[PDB]
Amino acid sequence: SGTILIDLSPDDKEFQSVEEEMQSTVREHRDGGHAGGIFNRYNILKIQKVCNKKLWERYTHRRKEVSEENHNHANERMLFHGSPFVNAIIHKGFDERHAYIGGMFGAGIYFAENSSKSNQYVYGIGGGTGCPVHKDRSCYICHRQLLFCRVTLGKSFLQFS
């Protein structure tokens, strides 16, 4: 695949800033916890850096195209993405298989500023049937994974909702 995962130490400034963004963007959800569980905070177990030369160069090439179409402004953000396909994403990169055809804003790939919003999709649409072991959308035992991603928004269409 070409991907390697570098485990970060909890003492690393880069671990601590990523943990902080994870924890500070939790919110309550209108479903009372139905899809993603009931919680105000996480226990962070590991943070790994994803390194893949081809995928990085594919990203920066598109970033430059977007930037030149938008007064030299990629409008780059760091956002969360939860999906049952995280393991494929990190090795193969994002593509149309990771888009939600039936999503509110069209057949695209969805990202969130609230880490707790992405947590609702770790086990699939609406939390699916919850964790594989216990079939529990609010499982406090089983380990979950999210991605913290670098995303190019360019000129973004504003949708009020």
């Binding site: 105000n40 226990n43 790994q48 598109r62 994002f94 999503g103 969805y110 990202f111 919003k117 979950r144």
Partner: peptide, 26 residues
Amino acid sequence: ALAEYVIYRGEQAYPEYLITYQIMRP
């Protein structure tokens, strides 16, 4: 609630950090 975003080219995101975690019971 904070904003949510959609992209339609997979080349517009790079997965930088893989975060392993548990939610915590209040």
